[PDB]
Symmetry: D5
Subunit: 131 residues, 10 copies
């Protein structure tokens, strides 16, 4: 067995190919996935796994230089919005309209679907560099 | 969005094709997957999701006529062994040696990998019929 | 066997991947299917299954926020036009010319072909969200 | 549009390649489909389409020289057992145990899944020749 | 064996998927086939099969709404040109320059190559509707 | 255009790869095709193209060292049986039961389906060598 | 074995699909091949096979109506330039700059790589028609 | 970028899928790779990378329960044989003849080719379990 | 461009993957190629390229450990037989019956077709090791 | 085994297809790889293989007519910037902004990932010609 890194086999393969500026998406159960973008569905049931649990694991296994989210999250999901601001305190966090956000997901290497059943609980993690 | 059934998109597709006697495997993080058998990895980190949570969701979404498990589970994982006996009280539960168990997984339609980090926490669910 | 959700295996797989705003098409026996769009043909013979039977089952298994149809349906197929109004009384219904309608089918995740042999008996169901 | 023959596009493609002795299977909603065998699911809901309706359409679009069903159908599904005898008057009807029946389906060019929710409502149609 | 419809298996598959306005092309031995368009070659030797024989069969198995040919056919192949006018008396026959004709072939579902060794013996059949 | 050789593009490709002892099959409209063997269907309608016309073209474009046919052809299809004897007078002709003939088609590089509607009008052409 | 036509199996397949105006390229060892264009490499070692030998065989097996070559060939490779003029005296020969020549290879059905080690020893053969 | 685990992207994907008892092979530049086994070639030039460098990195990123090597390594490659003994001092090391060794490579998930130019410098690492 | 090694791109790819004991076949124009074995056809016309020319090039670019040919070559092709003996003076040359020779070709990584039009001008080159 | 040329099997296949002006990229561990471009990862651990070592091997196995690097390398990576100037003395070295550089990589036939952990250690080698 693999000794280090993320436990999920599908996710390990995606992280392995990440280069500077590549993007991956963490999404709630309702975000549509653009045609041609790989979808890894980790959901089991509503709320499992949660957006917070998934984002935390990725933050620990991936070098993130920037986080992108939809402005709407501040209005309909303060709970998760705060979590995001706290988790990525050192990184740059940009808010765009949800419409623009969706547009940006077309360039993602993958969309990770969580079981999160709350509004606009989605974010784009942009890969940094280790040197 | 889909109104009923299992939330996970990968799993929904597998359940959709199940016919009487078809088998699927729920497995801990260490079970090897036979070549040619589809692998759906739901693990996020050790213990998430747990064997119990995964087995419970499947029991509710799939008609199971028989459950197969390795005798070794009774010796090294009484906790999960009891859970299994309780969850599938109405179904037939058969214990085989772990070696035989692995052999049977070659005929499964899929292996669902959980984040369970305890010994022999694996079982084979054999599909029943609705009429 | 799968206990909940739509009975058709091909359809279950499509519903499983629907995200907010994704579209699927229910078509009569004559609608052309754009290249690149998956076609699931349920027809057996003229009139079986009917547009009404198909649309009703889908309404029960999918959360629809908007319905789109060709304006020509009102004048050439009153029975079915009324059926739609009644079935999706709570959703927004939009009428476009058949020409524009056909153009929209290019973005659909799938086209479900029925055995319907009456004019303009087609519609686009746009997925809503569960939270 | 195609003027003659069966309406279903998927089925038309299967019938087109049929040669003397090739086999296709008409199945109820529970029959498991062997790996590698093409599956065409026409089901919409329990009981639609019915085994009888599907078998009737195939009978008039395909030259059948022999029908094969499971003996169990005579005891558990007398109504559909009679339908077959009546529908395939001139053809040779052979009965086998359900187990042997399933073995034969591995050689089928395709399995057509109906919405039939009654025990052992399955049969294999063996293609005849037109000269 | 298949009881009704066109005898050729490849062609039956093409006709089965035809929807209103879909196009197929019947070509002589020299017409180039655009990249991406399926080619079904029925030629055996020069003159076999003939343009006329192939067109006659398709006219009988397909609902033709409109026929398109190159104006050059009237100048260099009056024999086949007259044939076309008579075979499709009831349908609309449009003449375009051979150059425009070729551009339209790129939208066809298939090109059927015949053994015809006479100039401009090509035509596009546009599918109609059965209701 | 290609100046020499067989006119049919599909067949030209198969002949191009023939080595000493490779086999191709010419079949009537009813011969079943083993799974995995390429099928090139040249049929248009019953009797077109005929078994005789197809065999004659192949004989002229391929170096045949041996011909294999079913014994049943001599009694059930005298006309074609005589034709085969005349066309391949130089080569060795071997007659096997039809059942044994069919097993042999498993090793063929391709089965050419003709429009022939007369019994046992099939034969295997075994490639010879040009030096 | 195939009695007539070009000996190379790869090339025989390309010639079989040629229609009026289709193009194939004969190249020296250095010509780059555009992505998506089939490359058939016949080279063995420098000078084997030569540009001249390859062009001569193709000229005898393909109906060429036009030849296109880079203007630079006349000054940098006089020997081959003369050869091209002699071999294709009947057909139309057009000279374009090498850069423009390369853009043209994008539309070729295939690039045949020879062992030629002399500059600008490339040419495009445009298919003619046999009637 | 991925923060933890093995640096090589191809290798990370292989490690991610390892289950208990799965095998991977580290090979010198001359070992033949069985058909069907994925080959990841890390060689740059003779001696780079070395067997020792490769084996050491893998030992750090993978939980190995058993090592298998060819007995011939002890006599023909003492330096490397000793290196293995030392590196995997805590694991079980099994020596088979090179012939039997090669047979075992057929079951490997992958063969990692190094730039090692010394005799029998190959080994099979058998994955252990983390709990 | 590639500076060193064999000039042919297809062949370079085959040589690159060769491991100790791997086999490639050099064949005359009539040798049949087993299903599943890659065929690289270098033939242009009869006699070009010659068996001798092709074998000479491979001998120079590949480390040959053993050579296998059919005994029949000594009887019907003494010229090429002597060539082989001289070219591979240092290597082991084994003669088997042509029938056994053919069975061994099924294990080859590739068959290289030459333009050789003389009997039994075929041979299997078994790869050696560079250390 | 292959006697001459680069040792890496993956790289050998890429070099084999190189034509005049084709490009390959040598990258550090952080460079993102455009979609559709082949990625060959040689990295083993940070610093192995090094940018210099990889570039040196490619230089002697590939005819390079022009090198392209990012201007940023001169300021952030002076050591590797000098290496390049020194290694490619005769070749033309062009510098562009890192952004323009990345755009050019979309046209590369492949990206070779090294274990180089230093800023802007990337370069594009443009293939020259051998005559
Ligand atoms: O689920 C997503 C969003 O988070 C929001 O709920 C709107 O619909 C989808 O786009
Ligand atoms: O992880 C599984 C078992 O559950 C046990 O831990 C032994 O190794 C694997 O087969
Ligand atoms: O069948 C469809 C329509 O419903 C109408 O019948 C016109 O032709 C097709 O576009
Ligand atoms: O559904 C089929 C049978 O008809 C019976 O119900 C038993 O299970 C399946 O094999
Ligand atoms: O064969 C076709 C035409 O019918 C005409 O002969 C001109 O060349 C091809 O385009
Ligand atoms: O069509 C073939 C035979 O020629 C015969 O007609 C019997 O059925 C098929 O096997
Ligand atoms: O090899 C070709 C040309 O013939 C010329 O040598 C220049 O480089 C390539 O484009
Ligand atoms: O390279 C391998 C071995 O390590 C040994 O060198 C013999 O040849 C191959 O099998
Ligand atoms: O061409 C080959 C042989 O070399 C011999 O000519 C016999 O036929 C084929 O098997
Ligand atoms: O790794 C590369 C560069 O060399 C630099 O480190 C910036 O990120 C990537 O583009
Ligand atoms: Cl990892
Ligand atoms: Cl479902
Ligand atoms: Cl039909
Ligand atoms: Cl090489």
């Amino acid at each position: 067995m693999k000794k280090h890194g993320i436990l999920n086999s599908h996710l390990a393969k995606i992280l392995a190919d990440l280069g500077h500026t590549d993007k991956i998406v963490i999404a709630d159960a309702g975000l549509p996935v653009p045609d041609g973008v790989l979808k890894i569905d980790l959901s089991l049931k509503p709320g499992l796994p949660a957006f917070q649990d998934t984002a935390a694991v990725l933050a620990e296994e991936m070098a993130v230089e920037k986080v992108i989210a939809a402005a709407e999250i501040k209005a309909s999901n303060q709970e998760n919005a705060k979590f995001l601001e706290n988790l990525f305190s050192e990184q740059e966090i940009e808010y765009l309209s949800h419409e623009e956000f969706k547009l940006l997901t077309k360039d993602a290497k993958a969309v990770i679907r969580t079981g999160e059943f709350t509004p606009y609980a989605n974010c784009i993690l942009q890969a940094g560099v280790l040197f």
